[PDB]
Design a protein around this ligand. Structure first.
Ligand SMILES: Nc1ncnc2c1ncn2[C@@H]1O[C@H](COP(=O)(O)OP(=O)(O)OP(=O)(O)O)[C@@H](O)[C@H]1O
Ligand SMILES: Nc1ncnc2c1ncn2[C@@H]1O[C@H](COP(=O)(O)OP(=O)(O)OP(=O)(O)O)[C@@H](O)[C@H]1O
Ligand SMILES: Nc1ncnc2c1ncn2[C@@H]1O[C@H](COP(=O)(O)OP(=O)(O)OP(=O)(O)O)[C@@H](O)[C@H]1O
Ligand SMILES: [K+]
Ligand SMILES: [K+]
Ligand code: NA
Ligand code: NA
Lengths: 431, 208, 431, 133, 190
C-alpha cells in the first residue's frame, strides 16, 4: 500500500487544485472543466504545459493556487504530510516512516525523517533568497505589487522545475539578461540535482568524501550540460528563427539556457517551434533523461541512464562487473534501472501512438509533446494549445505517470506474492 | 608518495587508516570482499584481488607504488609468493609482516627490504612493562642505553636527588598533570618522568 | 578475431557486388558509384531499399548478381565459406568451427557443422519448390524466359527476407492474389523464424519436445502477427489511400500481408506513404523487433524482446526470477538482451539524428527510413529515392550494422582484457 | 491422471521417467537444482522446491494431484513432514518411500496411504534367487 | 591433427602449452573456472565443462578430435567415467593419466588406448639418478640394453680406453661418431 498511498494522495491534489482554479475568484475568463483539470495537473505534476496563458486567464488568487500546487508537487505529497503531522504534535510511527522511505526512493529508513526536515527548510530558504535576488531586477519593470509577486512566482516555479511563467512570452524577453538567466538556471539545477545530493554536499565538503550517487550526479550533470550546450550552439548558430540574429554574448546565454532547461524545468528563451529538427531530436533524448533521483525533476533519472549505459559498455568490453568510480554496481541496481527505462519507453510509445490516432498534427510535434509531458518538462513546439479534449486527457495521464514514476504507478495496482520455488534453467538465443 | 597495503587485517588495516588520515594515496588490496568493503572509505582505492596472481597484480598498476606493504602474517604461502612477485616486478621498497622465525628467514632470502614482527615486538615491550610496573614506555637507543618513561620521589626537588653524577642518567622531562617540561633545571618539585641513561644505571634509580 | 572475420568478410562482399553492378553488362542506364554501392549493400544486407528500380535499371545479368548477393547475405558469409571448404576436401578445424559458432550465434560448438549442412540444403530445396509454385502463376503473365526468372528471383528474395521486386509496383498488383500472398509470406515467415527453430521442428515433431527457444519463436510469431493484423485492419479500414476502396476479401489479404512484411521482408501491397500515422507508429515497433535469432531476418530478435519484456514484468510483480514456459532465464541471457536492445536503440537514434542534419525531409519519413534500414526491412514512405549522397552513405552504414548485429560490430573493434579484480559495492538510486 | 513425484533419486527419478514414458502428466519436485535440471526433460513440470514448506507446496497446485509419491527415503524428517503436509492438504493418495521399520511406523501413524520399501523388497527377491540358483 | 586435453593440472596443462607451442589446435577442458582462464591463452579453445556429462561432452564437438587426453589422475570416478563416455563416442585414441595400479586396471578394462603414469615414471628415473650420481639421463632400449648419458677419464683419449661410445659433450659441443650404448650389466662395469 505505500505505493497506493502515493498514487491516491497525488491524484486527490489534482482534483482539489482543479476545483479551486475553476472558481470565479481564481479566474478572469470562463474556464472549461478540461482546461482547469489540465492546468491543475500541469501544476501538481510540475510540468508547465499551458493550454491557457497563466498571466491573463488567472487572477492573483488563481496564480497563488498555482504556486501552492507547484510547491506541493515539487516537494512531493508525503513531504508536507510529515510536516503537518509533526507540527500537530503527532510522532512519526514505523508505518508512516515507511511511507516516507517509499516516497523519497530511499533504500533504508535510516534518518529519513531528518531528511524531510532538511529538504523543506532548504527549499523555503533558497526560494526566498532567489526571490529577493529576482526582486531587485523585476521591481522597476512591474512596480511593487506585481514585481514582488512575479519574482516570488518564478522563484518557486524555477526551483521546483515547473516552467510556469506569468509573462506571455515565457522568458523570451530576458535572453541577454544575466540576472534572470543565472538565478533561474541555478534554481532548477539545484532543485533537480537531488535532495540527497544537496544534503551530502552540505555536511561533507570534499569531493572524495561524497557518496557514489553524489559523485555520479555532480559529474554527470556537468558533462551532460556541457555536451548539450555545444550541440545547441553549433546546430542553431545560423538558424534565423532562433540564435541567428543575436549577438555572440546573447548566443552563449541562449545556448546555455536551452541546454539545461530540458532537464526538466521547461523554461525557454528561444522558440522551439522554429528550431532545426537536429536540435529537437537531441532535446528528445535530453528530456527523456531527467535529473537527480529524489528531487523536483522527473523522467528517467541521470543515474538510471548512467547505470544502464555503463552496464552495456562493460558487457561490450568483456568485463564481468559494472564499475563506476571504482565501485561495483550490483544486479538489483541494474534490474531496477532496466525496469525504469523499459516501462518509461513503453509509456511514451503508447502516448505517441494514442496521440497520432486522436489528433491530426505533425509527427515531430506529437513526439516532442509526449516526451515533454512524460518528463514533466513542459517545452512545446506549438501543439498544446491545439490539443483536443481527448488529446488533453492523454497528456494528463502521461504527466501524472511521469511525475509519480512508472515503477510506483505499476506497484500501486500490481499485487506481489512471494514464491520460494525455482525453475530449471532454460536456454534462449538473444542475438 | 603512493603506498600499497596488501592484506587488510588488524595490522594492515591499521596502516591504511593511519596513512589515509595523514593524507596519502593508499591502495588497499585484500582477497576477502567484506574486508575491502569495510576499508573502502579508508583508502584512496580498494580492490578485491588475489595478490599471489601476477595478472591481478599487474591489473592494479602495482609498479606505480614506491612502497608496498605485505600485511599477511598467518599465510606463509600467500605472504612469500606475493613478495616474490613484487620483487620480480622491481618494487623499490617491500615491507612484509612475518609470522615466525622460519617465515622471517624465507623472506630475507627472497628479498624483503624490511621484515616486521608486530605481535612479537609488542609482546617484548609489554613483558618489560609487566616486569617493572614503574616502566610505562621505553625506547631502546642501543643494547646498553635506553630512554625509559617512569612515593619516595614525591615532594622531592630535582637538586635533592644527585643521580645526575652518581647514577649517571639525565632527566629528559617530567610530566606535571598534562604539562611537559623541557630541559628541567634544578630545582623542580617532583609530584606523584623521562630519563635517559645506561640500561644498568636506569635499574639502579628504580631501586632508590 | 572471429567477430573481425565476420565484419571484414561481409564488407568485402559489398565491394565485390558493387563492382559487378557497376559494369556495363549488368546495367542498362549509367549508374553512379553511390547508387551501385547502395544497391549492393541493400542486397548483401538483404534490406531491399531501392534507390533505382531493379526491373529497369539492371539487366538480366545484373539481376542475377542481385540474386547472388541476396543469397550470400541471407544465409550469412560463413555458411558458404564452410561449404566451399568442405567441397574442396578440406576438413573443418577447431578454429574454423569457432567461426561458425560465432556466425550462427550458437552458445556451443556441438554439431554446428551439421547445422550448416542442414540449413543450406533446406534453403535451396524450399526456394526451388516455392519457385515452381510461383512459376505456374507467373508464366502466363510473362511467358517463359521472364516468367521463370521472375519466380526464381522472388522466391530467393522472399525466403531471404529481401523485399526486392522486379515489378515497378512492389507486389501492389497482387493484393487479392492468394497464390502470391500465401507463397511469399510463407517464404519469409519460415526464412526468418530461425534455422535452429526449423531444425528442431524437423526432428522433433511434438510441441512439448521443442526447446525453450523454439517454443518462444513459434508462440511469439503467432501472437505478434495476430496483434499486427488486427491493428492494421482496424486503423486502415476507412483510409481511402490504402485498404479503403477494396473488397473485404482483399482487405483481409492486404491487412495480413502488411502485418507480417515488417518482420523483416519489406514487401508491400499497400502504399505506406498514404497510411495513417497510427499504423506507421505501430510498424516502427514492429520492424524494430525482428524475427528468429539465427535466420535471414534482422533487428532485435523476437526472443530478445520477450526476454526483456518478461524480465521487466517479473520485476514489477516482485518475482526474483524471470520465468517463461516454466523455465528460468539466467542473468547472462538478460544482460546480453539488454546490450542488444540498448546498442540498437542508440544506433537508430544516431541515424535519425544524422539524417535530420543532412536532409530536409519530413520527420516521420526520416524515422521510418532509419528503422527500416536498421532492421533491414526495406519499407519506404518515399524518402529513399530523394536521399542525398551523404544521406545514402548514412543508410549504408545503418544497413551494414543492422545485418551484422550491433554486438558483433562492436566486438570487432573492441578489445577485451580479462581482469579478475573486483570492487566494493556502491549504492546509487535509479528511481 | 496427474501424478506428483517429490524427491528425484534413484527411486523417485525412475517413477518420473516411467510415468512420463507412458504418457502421463508428472510434476517432479526436488530441493536439489542439479536433479531438477536433469529431469526437466523427463517430466511435464519440474520445480526446485522444498516440500517441507506449506507455502511452496501450495505454490505448485499440489491439491490438483490425485497421487503424490514422496520418494525421500534417507531423510526421515523431510519424508515425514512432507506427508504430514500432504495429509493436511487432503491429498487422496500418498505413497511414501520408507527408510527402515521405525520410519514405516511413523508414516503409518501420520496417514501414509501406501508405504514402499524398494531396497528391502528387492533384497528379498535377490536373496531368494541366490539361495535357489 | 586436433587434440583435446581434459583436465588442466600440472600434467594436462603442460600438454596444452607444449602442443600449442608446436602449432596445433588444442581444446582445453576443465571443470574449474580459474584453470580455464589461466590456459585460455595457451589453447585454441578453452571451455569450462564437466567431462563426466555426455551432453556437455557433445556440446564441445568432441567427435571431431582424433586424440583426447584425459589428464585427471586424482579423481578415479571422474577419470573412468570420462573415458567410458569417450569410448562410447568412438574416439579413436584415448590417452588417460592413471592414479595407481587399480586405476590402471580399470582403464584397461574400459578401453583406454594408452595409460600414462607421469609421477611413477619420473620417480623411477629420478631414483636411478640418485643411486648413481654419474648417470644424468638414460633411455631403456630393452630390458638388458640401454643408452646412458654420463676424474679418471679426464685427459684420456678414446683409444686409451679399450672398452659403443655414442657421443661426448665438450662444453656445449657434441660429437657424432659422454653418451654410451651397451648392455645394462656392461654399462655398470664401465
Ligand atoms: N592472497 C591474498 N591476497 C590478498 N589478501 C590476502 C591474501 N591472503 C590473505 N589475505 C588477507 O590478508 C589479511 C591478513 O591475513 P591474516 O588474517 O591471515 O593474517 P594475520 O597475521 O592473522 O593478520 P593480523 O594480525 O594483521 O590481523 C586478511 O584480511 C586476509 O583476508
Ligand atoms: N525437502 C526435500 N524436498 C524435496 N526433495 C528433497 C527434499 N529432501 C531431499 N530431497 C531429494 O529427494 C531425493 C531422494 O532423497 P535421498 O537421496 O535422501 O533418498 P534415498 O533413499 O537415498 O533415495 P534413492 O534410493 O531413491 O536414491 C534426492 O534427490 C534429494 O535431493
Ligand atoms: N570432471 C572433471 N572434468 C574436467 N576437469 C576436471 C574434472 N575433475 C577434475 N578436473 C580437473 O582436472 C585437473 C587435474 O585433476 P587433479 O588435480 O585431480 O589431478 P592430479 O593427478 O592431481 O593432477 P596433476 O598431477 O596433473 O596436477 C584439475 O585442474 C581439475 O580441476
Ligand atoms: K517542468
Ligand atoms: K528486407
Ligand atoms: Na595477529
Ligand atoms: Na601429481
Amino acid at each position: 500500500t505505500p505505493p497506493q498511498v502515493l498514487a491516491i494522495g497525488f491524484f486527490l491534489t489534482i482534483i482539489i487544485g482543479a476545483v479551486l482554479l475553476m472558481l470565479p475568484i481564481s479566474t478572469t475568463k470562463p474556464l472549461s472543466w478540461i482546461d482547469a483539470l489540465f492546468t491543475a495537473a500541469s501544476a501538481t505534476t510540475v510540468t508547465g504545459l499551458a493550454v491557457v496563458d497563466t498571466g491573463t486567464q488567472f487572477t492573483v488568487f488563481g496564480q497563488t493556487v498555482i504556486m501552492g500546487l507547484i510547491q506541493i508537487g515539487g516537494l512531493g505529497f508525503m513531504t508536507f504530510a510529515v510536516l503537518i503531522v509533526m507540527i500537530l504534535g503527532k510522532k512519526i510511527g514505523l508505518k508512516e516512516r515507511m511511507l516516507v522511505q517509499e516516497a523519497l526512493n530511499q533504500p533504508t529508513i535510516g534518518g529519513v525523517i531528518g531528511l524531510v526536515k532538511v529538504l523543506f527548510l532548504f527549499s523555503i530558504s533558497i526560494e526566498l533568497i532567489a526571490a529577493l535576488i529576482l526582486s531587485i531586477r523585476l521591481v522597476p519593470q512591474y512596480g511593487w505589487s506585481s514585481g514582488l509577486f512575479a519574482s516570488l512566482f518564478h522563484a518557486i516555479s524555477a526551483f521546483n522545475n515547473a516552467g510556469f511563467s506569468l509573462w506571455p512570452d515565457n522568458l523570451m524577453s530576458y535572453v541577454g539578461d544575466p540576472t534572470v538567466n543565472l538565478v533561474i538556471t541555478f534554481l532548477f539545477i539545484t532543485g533537480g540535482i537531488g535532495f540527497t545530493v544537496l544534503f551530502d554536499v552540505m555536511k561533507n565538503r570534499r569531493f572524495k568524501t561524497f557518496s557514489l550517487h553524489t559523485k555520479l550526479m555532480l559529474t554527470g550533470t556537468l558533462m551532460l550540460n556541457a555536451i548539450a550546450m555545444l550541440t545547441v550552439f553549433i546546430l542553431e548558430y545560423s538558424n534565423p528563427g532562433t540564435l541567428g540574429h543575436l549577438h555572440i554574448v546573447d548566443k552563449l546565454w541562449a545556448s546555455y539556457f536551452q541546454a539545461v532547461t530540458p532537464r526538466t524545468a521547461g523554461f525557454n528563451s528561444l522558440d522551439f517551434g522554429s528550431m532545426r529538427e537536429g536540435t529537437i531530436v537531441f532535446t528528445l533524448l535530453l528530456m527523456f533523461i531527467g535529473a537527480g533521483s529524489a528531487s523536483t525533476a522527473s523522467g528517467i533519472k541521470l543515474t538510471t541512464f548512467i547505470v544502464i549505459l555503463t552496464s552495456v559498455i562493460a558487457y561490450l568490453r568483456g568485463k564481468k562487473e559494472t564499475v563506476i568510480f571504482r565501485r561495483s554496481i550490483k544486479y538489483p541496481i541494474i534490474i531496477k534501472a532496466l525496469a525504469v527505462s523499459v516501462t518509461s519507453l513503453f509509456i511514451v510509445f503508447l502516448g505517441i501512438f494514442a496521440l497520432t490516432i486522436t489528433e491530426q498534427a505533425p509527427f515531430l510535434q506529437i513526439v516532442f509533446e509526449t516526451f515533454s509531458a512524460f518528463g514533466t518538462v513542459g517545452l512545446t513546439m506549438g501543439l498544446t494549445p491545439e490539443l483536443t479534449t481527448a488529446g488533453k486527457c492523454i497528456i494528463i495521464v502521461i504527466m501524472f505517470i511521469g511525475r509519480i514514476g512508472p515503477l510506483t504507478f505499476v506497484f500501486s495496482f500490481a499485487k506481489t506474492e512471494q514464491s520460494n520455488i525455482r525453475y530449471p534453467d532454460g536456454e534462449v538465443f538473444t542475438g | 608518495k603512493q603506498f600499497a597495503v596488501i592484506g587488510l587485517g588488524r595490522f594492515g588495516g591499521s596502516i591504511c587508516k593511519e596513512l589515509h588520515r595523514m593524507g596519502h594515496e593508499v591502495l588497499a588490496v585484500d582477497i576477502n570482499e567484506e574486508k575491502v568493503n569495510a576499508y573502502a572509505s579508508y583508502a584512496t582505492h580498494a580492490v578485491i584481488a588475489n595478490a599471489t596472481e601476477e595478472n591481478e597484480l599487474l591489473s592494479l598498476g602495482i609498479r606505480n607504488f614506491e612502497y608496498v606493504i605485505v600485511a599477511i602474517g598467518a599465510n606463509i604461502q600467500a605472504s612469500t609468493l606475493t613478495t616474490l612477485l613484487l620483487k620480480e616486478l622491481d618494487i623499490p621498497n617491500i615491507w612484509v609482516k612475518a609470522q615466525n622465525y622460519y617465515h622471517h628467514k624465507v623472506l630475507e632470502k627472497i628479498g624483503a627490504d624490511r621484515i616486521i614482527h608486530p605481535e612479537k615486538d609488542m609482546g617484548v615491550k609489554i613483558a618489560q612493562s609487566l616486569s617493572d610496573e614503574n616502566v610505562l614506555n621505553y625506547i631502546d637507543l642501543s643494547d646498553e642505553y635506553s630512554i625509559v618513561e617512569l612515593r619516595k620521589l614525591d615532594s622531592k626537588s630535582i637538586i635533592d636527588l644527585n643521580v645526575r653524577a652518581k647514577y649517571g642518567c639525565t632527566i629528559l622531562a617530567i610530566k606535571h598533570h598534562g604539562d611537559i617540561c623541557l630541559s628541567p633545571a634544578p630545582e623542580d618539585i617532583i609530584r606523584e618522568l623521562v630519563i635517559m641513561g645506561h640500561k644498568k644505571d636506569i635499574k639502579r634509580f628504580e631501586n632508590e
